[PDB]
Design an enzyme around this catalytic site. Structure first.
Site, PDB file in Angstrom:
ATOM      1  N   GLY A 283      34.644  -8.212  81.563  1.00 34.51           N
ATOM      2  CA  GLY A 283      35.013  -7.954  82.768  1.00 34.51           C
ATOM      3  C   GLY A 283      33.918  -6.988  84.389  1.00 34.51           C
TER       4      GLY A 283
ATOM      5  N   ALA B 255      26.182 -11.905  67.527  1.00 33.76           N
ATOM      6  CA  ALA B 255      26.938 -12.073  66.502  1.00 33.76           C
ATOM      7  C   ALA B 255      25.701 -12.281  65.031  1.00 33.76           C
ATOM      8  CB  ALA B 255      28.412 -11.883  66.073  1.00 33.76           C
TER       9      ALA B 255
ATOM     10  N   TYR C 291      37.460 -11.587  63.612  1.00 36.17           N
ATOM     11  CA  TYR C 291      36.743 -11.882  62.472  1.00 36.17           C
ATOM     12  C   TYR C 291      37.153 -10.770  61.712  1.00 36.17           C
ATOM     13  CZ  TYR C 291      34.746 -14.809  66.265  1.00 36.17           C
ATOM     14  OH  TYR C 291      34.720 -15.792  67.746  1.00 36.17           O
TER      15      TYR C 291
HETATM   16  C1  LIG Z   1      29.061 -16.760  75.654  1.00 28.58           C
HETATM   17  C2  LIG Z   1      29.869 -15.823  74.920  1.00 28.58           C
HETATM   18  C3  LIG Z   1      29.294 -15.334  74.449  1.00 28.58           C
HETATM   19  C4  LIG Z   1      29.913 -14.081  73.406  1.00 28.58           C
HETATM   20  N1  LIG Z   1      29.580 -13.363  71.886  1.00 28.58           N
HETATM   21  C5  LIG Z   1      29.723 -12.681  71.107  1.00 28.58           C
HETATM   22  C6  LIG Z   1      29.547 -11.796  70.320  1.00 28.58           C
HETATM   23  O1  LIG Z   1      28.391 -11.903  69.746  1.00 28.58           O
HETATM   24  N2  LIG Z   1      29.901 -10.816  69.444  1.00 28.58           N
HETATM   25  C7  LIG Z   1      30.607 -10.240  70.767  1.00 28.58           C
HETATM   26  O2  LIG Z   1      31.028  -9.475  69.821  1.00 28.58           O
HETATM   27  N3  LIG Z   1      31.406 -10.401  71.405  1.00 28.58           N
HETATM   28  C8  LIG Z   1      30.616 -11.372  71.903  1.00 28.58           C
HETATM   29  N4  LIG Z   1      31.321 -12.139  73.364  1.00 28.58           N
HETATM   30  C9  LIG Z   1      32.163 -11.222  73.961  1.00 28.58           C
HETATM   31  C10 LIG Z   1      31.263 -10.134  75.396  1.00 28.58           C
HETATM   32  O3  LIG Z   1      30.309  -9.086  74.587  1.00 28.58           O
HETATM   33  C11 LIG Z   1      31.929  -9.020  75.862  1.00 28.58           C
HETATM   34  O4  LIG Z   1      32.438  -8.417  75.598  1.00 28.58           O
HETATM   35  C12 LIG Z   1      31.946  -9.961  77.611  1.00 28.58           C
HETATM   36  O5  LIG Z   1      31.196 -10.777  77.973  1.00 28.58           O
HETATM   37  C13 LIG Z   1      32.468  -8.846  78.872  1.00 28.58           C
HETATM   38  O6  LIG Z   1      32.926  -8.777  79.777  1.00 28.58           O
HETATM   39  P1  LIG Z   1      31.738  -9.834  80.782  1.00 28.58           P
HETATM   40  O7  LIG Z   1      30.883 -11.037  80.302  1.00 28.58           O
HETATM   41  O8  LIG Z   1      32.981  -9.950  81.576  1.00 28.58           O
HETATM   42  O9  LIG Z   1      30.635  -8.570  80.997  1.00 28.58           O
HETATM   43  C14 LIG Z   1      30.810 -13.190  73.953  1.00 28.58           C
HETATM   44  C15 LIG Z   1      31.344 -13.544  75.367  1.00 28.58           C
HETATM   45  C16 LIG Z   1      30.584 -14.385  75.862  1.00 28.58           C
HETATM   46  C17 LIG Z   1      31.041 -15.275  77.504  1.00 28.58           C
END
Ligand SMILES: Cc1cc2nc3c(=O)[nH]c(=O)nc-3n(C[C@H](O)[C@H](O)[C@H](O)COP(=O)(O)O)c2cc1C
Length: 350
Positions: free
Chosen positions: A287, A55, A179
């Site tokens: 997940g 983001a 957000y």
């Molecule tokens: C460290 C971290 C940072 C993340 N930052 C963002 C982000 O910048 N924008 C967003 O839409 N989701 C963010 N997410 C959610 C992830 O895009 C994503 O949906 C999630 O990691 C998917 O699940 P998984 O880790 O089990 O693959 C973040 C998740 C993590 C763990």
């Protein structure tokens, strides 16, 4: 169809259906400008069919955590060009995730100690702001005036133009995870009585306006939107989450965007529910592993499968999945902030 099958996404032909999910890493340089280390990081991950950036705030007003990159300044445009060049040199595709945190911020992260802005003057019930000094209680945000809403749309419009100048393949509008846009959508965080609150249509109106503005800059086949029907992160609740997301997903079918990206939930509001409601390309996240990613593609409920944490620790996740290889463990302690360690030092296979 499986994770390794090619797919069309808007104006691109991708070589596989694995997406690197957007992941905030808090590793920006001075003035929230991307730097060579960030370009290395994304370059290591180019085997994803599509990368979505972390983001990226469309204004200083829209930032809520330390060391996150922006897309509002020319210096930031030039920093992101490092990233787009590195990715494109290795033949990858990358979309920049346009951000505004709204109330999920703190006066200490704001210039001159300005209050964060929001649809309504309602602090998040849960959690703490992440300031440079450490965690601090959220303050109540300032409700945007009706005549300020055009300014918000212009922050997104200009950020979309800046992404385009930086060489991205497209943009994703972050309308998820509690957000600013998501705070508009939810009637627990939006108590407005102008045309941006009240009815479901009105709570969705800022997202529709932002999407229209961003599409006008890029073309709809280079624009995606991400939402969280079962997402409660950011103290965001609603009376009828289903209906609210049932109309928002039905209102995005008139924009014909490259994709809709859903965070999956237990709540009914999965991609199985939304598949017959959305009429374009669906990216599903949350997940997944190799088995469950192939399964959702087999079910027909999603078109692409995004991976977050496993992409942090496995830059060549697609090849590891192909060869049924073991994965590197991920170290949650270095997800947010720090230096090269736990960022660019996770190895690909030997
Ligand atoms: C460290 C971290 C940072 C993340 N930052 C963002 C982000 O910048 N924008 C967003 O839409 N989701 C963010 N997410 C959610 C992830 O895009 C994503 O949906 C999630 O990691 C998917 O699940 P998984 O880790 O089990 O693959 C973040 C998740 C993590 C763990």
């Amino acid at each position: 169809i499986d994770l390794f099958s090619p797919v069309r996404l808007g104006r691109y032909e991708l070589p596989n259906r694995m997406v690197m999910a957007p992941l905030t890493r808090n590793r920006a340089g001075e003035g929230n400008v991307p730097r060579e280390l960030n370009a290395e990081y994304y370059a290591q991950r180019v085997s994803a069919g599509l990368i979505i950036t972390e983001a990226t705030q469309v204004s200083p007003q829209g930032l809520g955590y330390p060391f996150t990159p922006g897309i509002h300044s020319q210096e930031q445009v030039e920093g992101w060009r490092l990233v787009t060049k590195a990715v494109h040199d290795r033949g990858g595709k990358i979309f920049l995730q346009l951000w505004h945190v709204g109330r999920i911020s703190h006066p200490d992260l704001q210039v001159d100690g300005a209050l964060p802005v929001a649809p309504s003057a309602i602090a998040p019930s849960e959690g703490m702001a992440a300031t440079y000094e450490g965690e601090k209680p959220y303050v109540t945000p300032r409700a945007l005036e009706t005549a300020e809403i055009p300014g918000i749309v212009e922050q997104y419009r200009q950020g979309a133009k800046n992404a385009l100048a930086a060489g991205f393949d497209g943009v994703e509008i972050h309308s998820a995870n509690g957000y600013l846009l998501d705070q508009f959508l939810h009637d627990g965080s939006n108590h407005r009585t102008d045309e941006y609150g009240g009815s479901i249509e009105n709570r969705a109106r800022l997202l529709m306006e932002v999407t229209e503005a961003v599409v006008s800059v890029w073309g709809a086949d280079r624009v995606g939107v991400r939402l969280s029907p079962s997402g409660t992160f950011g103290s965001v609740y609603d009376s009828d989450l289903k209906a609210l997301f049932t109309y928002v997903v039905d209102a995005l079918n008139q924009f014909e965007l490259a994709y809709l990206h859903l965070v999956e939930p237990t709540s009914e509001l999965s991609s199985k529910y939304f598949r017959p409601i959305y009429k374009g390309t669906l990216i599903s996240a949350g997940g997944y592993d190799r088995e469950s990613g192939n399964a959702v593609l087999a079910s027909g409920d999603a078109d692409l499968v995004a991976y977050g944490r496993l992409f942090i620790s496995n830059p060549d996740l697609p090849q590891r999945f192909a060869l049924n290889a073991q994965l590197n463990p991920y170290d949650r302690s270095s997800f947010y902030g720090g230096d090269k360690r736990g960022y660019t030092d996770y190895p690909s296979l030997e």
